[PDB]
Design a protein around this ligand. Sequence first.
Ligand SMILES: O=c1ccn([C@@H]2O[C@H](COP(=O)(O)OP(=O)(O)O[C@H]3O[C@H](CO)[C@@H](O)[C@H](O)[C@H]3O)[C@@H](O)[C@H]2O)c(=O)[nH]1
Length: 412
Amino acid sequence: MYEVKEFSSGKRKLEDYKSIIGEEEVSKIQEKAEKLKGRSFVHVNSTSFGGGVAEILHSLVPLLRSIGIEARWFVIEGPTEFFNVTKTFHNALQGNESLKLTEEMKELYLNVNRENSKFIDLSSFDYVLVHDPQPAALIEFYEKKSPWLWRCHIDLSSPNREFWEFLRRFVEKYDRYIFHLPEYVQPELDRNKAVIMPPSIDPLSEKNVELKQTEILRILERFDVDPEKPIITQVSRFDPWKGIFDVIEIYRKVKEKIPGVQLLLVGVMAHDDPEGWIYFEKTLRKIGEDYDVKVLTNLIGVHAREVNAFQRASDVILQMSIRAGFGLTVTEAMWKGKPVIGRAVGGIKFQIVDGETGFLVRDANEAVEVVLYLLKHPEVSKEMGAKAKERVRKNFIITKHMERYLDILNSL
Ligand SMILES: O=c1ccn([C@@H]2O[C@H](COP(=O)(O)OP(=O)(O)O[C@H]3O[C@H](CO)[C@@H](O)[C@H](O)[C@H]3O)[C@@H](O)[C@H]2O)c(=O)[nH]1
């Protein structure tokens, strides 16, 4: 078990967001964190590098720090055979009821959880929070003297039975379980000690920070994207159920009346995600030699900062997911003042206030209508964008995410 101590984001302090949230909120926040001043609020997970969760802590911990709470962050160490197993666990918990949980696995998972719990005495802190499955078992290697919270960053609606019944022996021990959406809360758990806490975006990160026109134009020209013509964009993982092919049809029907329209299919995926690269290849084969369609991925040099650009340069952003999680992508777009058009699923039906911040449609033809409408009425589009930004500012910001943590600690 290791400890971060440093923070990439730097010294993320509430003050760094004052301009973004206003002083009434910066106060409302400071007030709620005084009643917990000097407390111990530690976090435990699997890494401080590869992961959005890690990126969240790098800003969330400093923040808690700078507001009177002695927040601290510990990580778990381990051999490949542990993460490969936890990878199986991860996929098993999210469907894929074709994986087998063997004893060799349980031994390794639990053991690794044993050795890592002898480096730091988590039970000595006022509040303990554990992130995802990898360290969920730490709770039975100490004598609780304070509340322990279980933060889940994945779906648990249709979990491989075998695997859930195992992880459940540890989860049920925590005082509270935290899920992104009220569809991830497995019934085997007491819905009174369950908590809905949507993920959040950080206004000051590479992905969301506001770039300067010159840079946006440098990234645009680099990927042969004409900013002087209209642009529609869908940011997402390349898999069979994200509407990627529907989007391609919306771009084509739209393109009959607006022959200059461009489509940006943006997606960052890990190189050990064969599934996603196959679907990627399939998309290119489907698009053919129509270069008004831009397939932009990290294979070609696209990362957080380029994604930022692509979203800012978009006139309309889509999310025709058939099956979706919370949809932080819709959150980022909304925060950038863009009207979103997407199916009503997962976090997409929650974030979009149809007809106000964006539109919830049922198919591609309904999608085509609204894209033309929006593109036709840039003022209506400016309006929908402005209100969608506010919804984010008042509901899904990292500072609002933290304030949610206070509310929970103030209720123990
Ligand atoms: O091509 C991409 C796709 C995503 N992002 C970033 O990732 C976030 C969006 O993630 P979403 O695209 O919101 O992630 P999910 O597809 O919802 O992740 C799935 O897989 C997760 C576990 O890995 C589960 O917890 C989720 O519920 C499940 O929906 C955004 O903030 C982006 O910054 C990119 O930069 N490029």
